[PDB]
C-alpha cells in the first residue's frame, strides 16, 4: 500500500511482474464485481437521475491530481487496500 515513487531503484528482476501484477489486479475485479442489492446499490443512486447536469464538484470532492492534472496515485493505494479487504472476505467464501 505504499505510494510508488520513481526515485526508488526497485529490483529489476522483480519489477518485470509489475505489469502482470496489474493484470492480476484487473482479473481480481472480474470475479469480485457482481450485482448488489438495491439497499446498498450506491451505483444506482448516482444513476437515479441520469440527465443531471449540476455544478461540477470542486477539487476537495475529487481525487487529487498532479501539476499536469494526471492522477497522483493516492487513489491506487485505496483501491489496493479495498481489493485486499475484498480478497480476504471472498477467501472465506469457499467450500471450507
Amino acid at each position: 500500500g505504499e505510494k510508488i515513487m520513481q526515485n526508488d531503484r526497485g529490483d529489476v528482476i522483480i519489477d518485470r511482474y509489475l505489469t502482470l501484477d496489474q493484470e492480476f489486479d484487473r482479473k481480481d475485479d472480474d470475479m469480485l464485481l457482481h450485482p448488489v442489492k438495491k439497499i446498498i446499490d450506491l451505483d444506482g443512486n448516482i444513476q437515479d437521475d441520469p440527465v443531471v447536469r449540476g455544478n461540477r464538484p470542486d477539487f476537495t470532492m475529487q481525487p487529487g491530481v498532479d501539476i499536469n492534472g494526471n492522477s497522483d496515485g493516492t487513489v491506487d493505494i485505496l483501491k489496493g487496500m479495498n481489493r485486499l479487504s475484498e480478497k480476504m472476505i471472498m477467501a472465506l467464501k469457499n467450500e471450507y
Binding site: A91, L92, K93, N94, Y96
Partner: protein
C-alpha cells in the same frame, strides 16, 4: 496471537462428534477479543453446529461481539440470553457459576 472462532468451533464440533445423543452437546467460550480471524466462512460452521444440536454459550470480556451474539442466538434456538458479558470481578464469578447449571 490472534484468535480464531471458526477453528475453535470446528475443533469443538470434532470433539463433540462421538458424544451420544442422550448427552447434551454444549460449548462454553470465554472470548476476550473483539475481532476474530477465520480461515473460512464462519456461517457455515454456525449452520453445522446448529445441525449437530450444539448449544454455544459465550462469556465475552470487552463488549458485545455481533458474531458471538448471532452464534449464541442460532445455537440456542433463538435465545439471546446465552451471550453473557461481565461487569467486574463479582459478575465474572457469577457468570462462571451460572454455567455449572444444566441448560
Amino acid at each position: 496471537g490472534n484468535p480464531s472462532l471458526q477453528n475453535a468451533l470446528e475443533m469443538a464440533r470434532g470433539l463433540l462428534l462421538p458424544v451420544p445423543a442422550h448427552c447434551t452437546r454444549e460449548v462454553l467460550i470465554v472470548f476476550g477479543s473483539l475481532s476474530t480471524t477465520d480461515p473460512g466462512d464462519i456461517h457455515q460452521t454456525i449452520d453445522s453446529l446448529v445441525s449437530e444440536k450444539i448449544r454455544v454459550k459465550v462469556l465475552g470480556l470487552s463488549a458485545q461481539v455481533a458474531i458471538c451474539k448471532e452464534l449464541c442466538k442460532a445455537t440456542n434456538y433463538g435465545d439471546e440470553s446465552f451471550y453473557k458479558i461481565l461487569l467486574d470481578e463479582t459478575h465474572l464469578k457469577e457468570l462462571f457459576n451460572e454455567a455449572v447449571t444444566p441448560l
